Ligand binder design. Structure first.
Ligand SMILES: [Zn+2]
Ligand SMILES: [Zn+2]
Lengths: 48, 397, 397, 397, 397
C-alpha cells in the first residue's frame, strides 16, 4: 500500500526490510502517511 | 496532445473498419489518413519509461504503406496490416502510461514526458482527426477558453465526512440535541436528534440545519430527496467529541417537519423546495442547505406518550432526518463518478508501476483528499491525466 | 424538425473533424454537406425568444462558403471557419430553448415556435443526414408508426408515494396489522407488520400484499429483489390515518415467508418468482404485485418467546418486508432515469428564463405530478422537449 | 458471425442516413456497401425457428438495386428503399432469436442454427464492415486470442448469499458471537456481533473477518467503502443454524475498529486499505477480505455502561459492520451489471418463446446460479448470446 | 480587446517619438502602423456613456494621412499631427471609462460596452501591435490558457481583521489567556497573552498559534519576520466577546519561545522556519501558521518576580508576539498592492462618475470585502478592469 500511493526508492526499500532504524525513523518523522499507523497500531497492541 | 488522440481513433476506426471482406470504398477516406501517419513518423525515434518500476523502451519507425490498389479485401491484406497495428498499440500504451504518471506544479497542464513533449512539435500536427470523443471534445473547447462540460451518473462531489455536532450536551450525555451526518460521493444523510423531544422548546419545535459546500459547482443535477436518514435510525454507542468517553443514541423516528432544501450559488438561492420528496432538479449550485424540524407530537396515544416523559431520564431519542442523492449532474471540472473508469485507470497504472508520490496528487490519488483540496493545479493535472486515460481506453481496457 | 437535428450533427462532426492538421479528404464528404446548408439558409431571417425573461434576438445570414486549400488544413483555414460556426451555435441554442418552453394541448407534438415552424418548411428538407443519435432515431420510427424504444438506468417510473394501510387498528393503536411502503423512482420497499405476531391467525400466518401499477409498461427490466425493508425496520412515531394522533411502531424483523413476486401485463402474469432473491428479469409488465407472509415462529428460544406474549401489551412488533429495485429497463415512452440529463435540461432552461407555467406541464416540471397523470399530451410534449434537449446537448452542455 | 454484425450496422447506418432530402455524396460510400450485400444474398434460401413456441418462417431473396444518380434524395426514393429494409429487419430479428436460444456443451462458442452456420460460409464474408460496436470489437480481439475487456456500472459479480456464522453459541442463543452478511450483485454488507461486548476477550477486542471470492477477476474497480451495515443494525428474530428454533438479535452499533480491506489476486495482496472510508480503487483482484474488530469501549457514560453488564443476561448486542459497493469495474468475461440489457434481452426472448431448458444454462437464465457455477462453457455461450443481443439492440429495442 | 491596447502604445510611442526635429527614419516603421489605423477606422461610428453621471459623447472618423516624406520634421508637421492625436486621446479616455464600469455575472471576463464589443470585431484586428506592457503581456498568456503571474511590493492579500480569542476567561476578565491580532494588507501582528504567566501550566509554558488563510496563493515571497507585536504591547481597555462589558489588558513583553513559522500549500508544509527573525523566503503557499510560546522565566530578579505572583490578582500580563510582513511576492491573480494604482484608478473613475453599485463588485470597490469573497467572477472582472486601467495610464495619469 506504501509502495504504490507513494514511491519507495530502491535504496530505501532495501533498508525498510532490514528494518533499519534510520530510513524508518525518517518517514514516520518526515512524511507521516500510512507508516504512522503500522507503527502506532503496534503501540496500541502492546496493551497487556 | 490532440495529436495523441488521433493516433488512437486512427487505430480503433482501423482495427474496426478493416476486415476480411468489405469494399475499399468504405475505407478509402480512412486508408489515406492512416498512411499519412506512417510517413510523418518514420525516421523519428522515441523513448518511454524510466520512472519507478516502469521499464524503459525505445521505438523506431520504418514501415511500408498500404495497397490503395485492391477492390475488396483479402485475408492476406489484413494480417500484413494487423502486424503493423500491434506495434503501435503496444506503443501508445507505453506512451500513455509514461505521461499518466508525471505531475507538475508550475505548469501541470502541459505535457511532461520526453515522449509526448516531442509530439506537440509542429511537424506532427499533420495527423489530427475526428475529435468526437467527449473528453477531447472538451479538452479543445477549454484551450479556446469556452464553456466546457461533462456528464456524470452518481458524481463524486462530497469528500467523505461522517461526524456530529452536539448543540446541547452535558457530561452524562443523557439529554443531547444536535445533528449527525454522512456526506460521501453523491449522497448526504443527516439526522437531527433532541433527547427531550422539544419538551421545553418554543412551539415544541426544534430546528435543525445541515449545510454542505461543494468544491465545484454542479449544474443540471437530477436529485432524489427522501425523508428519514436510515443510517442514523438505529441504536449507537458513539465516542464523545473529546474522545474521552462514549454516549448512547437510541433513536425513535418522526417525520421531518417544515423541510426546506435550498441549492445556492454564491450565497443566492437558485432552487428551493419545501417538503418535496422524490425527484427534484437543482440547475446550478455550489451549496446545499437542508433545514428541517422536530416537532413534538401534539397528540399522542399512550404508547407514544410513554416514550416522551416530562422529566428525565430520556430513554427514547426523537430523531428526524433527510436523505439526498445526486443521481446525475454536469460539472465544468473533471470529477470521479459511479460509471467512468478514469480515476481508477490513473490510480491503477500508478499503483502497478510503483510510481513514487509526486508534488501534486495526494498519496494513492486518494479521492477524498483530492476533492477536499481541489486546487487549480490538481484539476489541471487531473484533467490532463483523465483525458489520457480516456484516449488509452479506446484501445486498451 | 428532423431538420433541426442535422444542424447540430453538422456542427459537432464539424467542430470535431475540422482541426489544424487533418488531411482534406477526411472531410471531403463532410465539407460538402456543410456548404449545402449555408446556401439554403442565407437570405431568410429569424426571430427567437419573446416569452418570460427569454430575450428576443434577431438572426440574419450572410456567409461565404468554404475553401479547400489542399493537403491538410492550415491554422488560418480553421479560424475563418470557427468564426462562422460560433454564430450557428449561439443560434441553435436560442432556437432550441425557444421551442423547449412552448406547450400545446391540442397539437403538442408539433413545432410551436416561429423559429421552428419555419424549418419544417419544404425548402429546408435538403439538409437532413446521419440520424444515429438514439433519440432522433426513435423520433422517426414513431412518425411512421413502429416499435420505438429507449434505454434507462434506474428508470423513474414510480411517483413518490410513502404511506401505510392499517388492516386492523383501534384507537390506542396498540395492536395494529397492515403495511407501510415507499414507492419512488425505480424502487419499492414494503413492510407488513402484525403487532400480535399472528397469535390468533389461521396457521399462525398473516398474509400481506403490495400492488404497484406502472403508468407505462416496462420491458426488459433487470431487477434486484431482496428480503427486508430497512426503511421500515426502525422505531417510529407515525401520524394516525385521520391525522388526529400518533402511534408507535417498534419493529422486530423476521424473514418474509412465501414470497411471491408477480409482474403482470393487463392482468396476466408474465413473470412470477417464488422466494427468489437477487437478480431477476421481468420482460414485459405494467404491474408489480408483491405477496409475502409473517409466520409466527413455531419454535422460540426464551429471548424470542419473551417478545411475543399470548396477551397484550404487544411491545415488539413482528415485521416482514421486501425491497425491489429496477436497475435497468426499456420503455416505449420517454421517462426520467438516473443517468440522462433531459428532464434536468428542460426543467433548468425553463427555471433560468422564468418561463410561466403553461397548460400542459405541472408547475416546475414536477416529476411526481407528471408521471402520476402522464397523459398523451404530456408525453408528446415531453418527447418533443426531451428530443430537443438531446439535440442541444450535442453542442452545449 | 462477424458477418451477422454488419447486416445490422448496415441497416442502422441505413434507416438512419437515408432520409427524404439528404445529399447523395453523404451516402455514396454507404450505398455501395449496401448493394454489395443484396447481390451476395440473392439466390439463397433460409429457414429459422422450429424450437418450442418459435415460428418457422421461410425466406428467399430476389431484389433490384438502387439508383446512384440524384444530387438529393426524393421522397419516392426512400419509400422504395424502406420497403426493402423492412424485410431484412423482420429477417435478422428471426435470425438472432433462432441462434439466441440454442446451447451446445461442446462448442458453445461456435454457431448453432441452420441459419447462421450458413453465414460463416466463405462466400458471405464479402459483406463485413465497420466493427466499432463495443461488443463485436471484443468478439474479434478474442477470436484472435488476445486481451479482451468490458465496462460495467454496478457489475453483478456476487451471487446472492445471505447468511450467518455463529462462532460462539449455545442452545438458548443468549450469548452469541459471529458474523452475518449479504453478498449480492456489486454489494457486500457484513456485521460482526458479540453479545458479551468483548467482556472476557483479550484486550477487550473481538476480531471479525469476511472473505468473498469472486468467480472472475475484476480490474479497475472504483469502490465505495463505508463503516456500518445498516441491513444488520435492527432487531431480528432469526432461524437457528439447524432450523430447529429461532434466536433474537438486538443490535447496538459501535464503530468498526482496525478496519482493513484487502483486495487479493491469487492469494497476493494487490491493494490494502486501513480504515479508509469513501472512495478507494482496487486495480486487479479475485478476492476481497474485510477484517474489522469490536473493541469494548474503555470509557462509558452511565447510559452506555448500562447496556454492557459484567454478567448475563446480555440484552443489547454490540455490533460493528462494513458496507462495500463496486460502482464500476472492468472484467475480461461478460457479466450482468446495472445498466446493460443483455442478460434481460436473452432471458426475455427465451421466456417469450417458451424455450425449453437446455444443457448449458440454469433454468430461467438464473443469474445467481449462473455466476455461482460460471463454467467455461456457460461463459462462451453467454458471450455468444450477449454479443448477439447487442447486435439485435442496434435495430430492435 | 488586445485591439484597444495598441490604440494607446500607438499614441504614446507617438506623442513621444514625434517631435519638432527628429529624423524621419526613426519613425518610418512607426508612421506606417499609425496610418494603417486611421484607415481601418474611418467610416465607423461610435458611442460611449449612458450610465449614471457619464456623458454620452458621439464620434465619427474621416481623416487625411501623413506625408512620409521629409529628412527631418518641421514644426508645422507636428501641430497638424497633434491635432489628430488629441481627438483619439479624448476618445480612448471615454472608451476606457465606459467599459471600466460595467460588470457581468455571466461573462465578467468578456467585453461589455457597445464601444468595445465592436472592436473585438475581426475587421479591426489589422491594428494590433507591440504588446510589452506587463499587463497585456499577461492578458494574452491567460487567454491562451497558460501560466500568468504579476509583481507586487507589499501586496494586499489580508482582508482587514482585528480581533481576539480568549482561550481562558471568566466574568471579571482578571485572568485571561488567548491571542489578539491584526491582519491587514501584507502584514500580520499577533500576540499571545497569559495573565497567570504560565504559573500552573505544564513545563510553565503556554502554547499559542495563529493561522491565516490566504484567498490566493502567493509565490516567491520575500518576508520580514520579527519578534514582538508592538501593536499589542500597550495597555488597553477592550470590549468583551459578547459586547456586554470591557476588560483591561496591561501587557509586559517577553521573548517569544520556540517560534515556528510554517508556509503551507494545500495542507503541506512548503517552508518552515524555527526562530529565524529577519528576512525569510516563502516560495509557494496559501496559508501561514505562526506558533509561539510564553515560557515563565525560570530565574527572576526581584523586580521581575514581583510582576508574577503565585496567586491573583494578576496585574502585569505576560505577552509574547510576532510581526510578519510580506515585502514582495508574485500572484497568479491580480491584487491591490502598495505601489500600483489600478485599484485606485478603477475605484476613482467609478466614484467620480457616480457609477451605481453593480452585481459583481462590493459597494465602493471595497478591498476588504472584495478579497474576503474573491469569487472567480470578481477576479475575472477585476482583471479586465485592472488591465484597462493600465492601458489608460499609458496616456492619462
Ligand atoms: Zn446507479
Ligand atoms: Zn513600502
Amino acid at each position: 500500500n506504501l509502495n504504490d500511493n507513494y514511491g519507495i526508492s530502491r535504496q530505501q526499500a532495501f533498508n525498510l526490510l532490514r528494518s533499519d532504524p534510520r530510513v524508518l525513523r525518517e518517514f514516520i518523522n518526515q512524511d507521516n502517511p500510512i507508516i504512522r499507523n503500522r507503527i502506532e497500531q503496534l503501540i496500541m497492541q502492546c496493551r497487556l | 496532445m490532440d495529436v495523441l488522440y488521433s493516433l488512437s481513433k486512427t487505430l480503433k476506426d482501423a482495427r474496426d473498419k478493416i476486415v476480411e471482406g468489405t469494399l475499399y470504398s468504405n475505407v478509402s477516406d480512412l486508408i489515406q489518413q492512416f498512411n499519412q501517419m506512417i510517413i510523418t513518423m518514420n525516421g523519428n525515434e522515441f523513448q518511454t519509461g524510466g520512472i519507478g518500476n516502469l521499464p524503459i523502451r525505445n521505438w523506431n519507425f520504418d514501415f511500408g504503406l498500404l495497397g490503395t490498389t485492391l477492390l475488396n479485401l483479402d485475408a492476406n491484406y489484413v494480417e500484413t496490416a494487423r502486424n503493423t497495428i500491434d506495434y503501435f498499440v503496444d506503443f501508445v500504451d507505453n506512451v500513455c502510461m509514461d505521461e499518466m504518471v508525471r505531475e507538475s506544479q508550475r505548469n501541470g497542464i502541459a505535457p511532461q514526458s520526453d515522449s509526448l513533449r516531442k509530439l506537440s512539435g509542429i511537424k506532427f500536427k499533420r495527423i489530427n482527426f475526428d475529435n468526437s470523443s467527449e473528453y477531447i471534445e472538451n479538452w479543445n473547447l477549454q484551450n479556446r477558453r469556452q464553456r466546457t462540460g461533462f456528464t456524470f451518473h452518481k458524481p463524486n462531489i462530497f469528500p467523505y465526512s461522517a461526524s456530529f455536532t452536539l448543540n446541547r450536551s452535558q457530561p452524562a450525555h443523557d439529554n443531547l440535541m444536535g445533528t449527525m451526518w454522512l456526506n460521501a460521493g453523491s449522497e448526504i444523510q443527516v439526522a437531527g436528534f433532541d433527547y427531550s423531544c422539544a419538551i421545553n422548546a418554543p412551539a415544541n419545535i426544534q430546528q435543525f440545519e445541515h449545510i454542505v459546500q461543494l468544491r465545484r459547482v454542479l449544474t443540471t443535477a437530477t436529485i432524489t430527496l427522501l425523508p428519514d436518514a436510515e443510517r442514523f435510525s438505529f441504536p449507537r454507542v458513539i465516542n464523545s467529541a473529546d474522545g474521552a468517553t462514549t454516549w448512547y443514541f437510541n433513536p425513535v423516528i418522526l417525520r421531518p417537519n417544515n423541510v426546506e432544501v435550498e441549492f445556492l450559488l454564491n450565497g443566492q438561492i437558485i432552487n428551493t423546495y419545501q417538503a418535496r420528496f422524490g425527484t427534484i432538479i437543482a440547475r446550478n449550485f455550489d451549496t446545499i442547505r437542508l433545514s428541517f424540524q422536530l416537532m413534538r407530537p401534539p397528540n399522542m396515544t399512550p404508547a407514544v406518550a410513554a416514550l416522551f416523559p416530562n422529566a428525565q431520564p430520556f430513554e427514547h431519542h426523537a430523531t428526524v432526518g433527510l436523505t439526498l442523492r445526486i443521481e446525475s449532474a454536469v460539472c465544468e471540472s473533471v470529477l470521479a463518478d459511479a460509471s467512468k473508469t478514469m480515476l481508477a485507470n490513473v490510480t491503477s497504472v500508478r499503483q502497478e508501476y510503483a510510481i513514487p508520490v509526486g508534488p501534486v496528487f495526494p498519496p494513492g490519488m486518494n479521492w477524498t483528499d483530492l476533492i477536499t483540496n481541489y486546487s487549480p493545479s490538481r484539476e489541471d493535472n487531473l484533467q490532463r491525466v483523465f483525458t489520457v486515460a480516456s484516449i488509452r481506453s479506446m484501445l486498451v481496457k
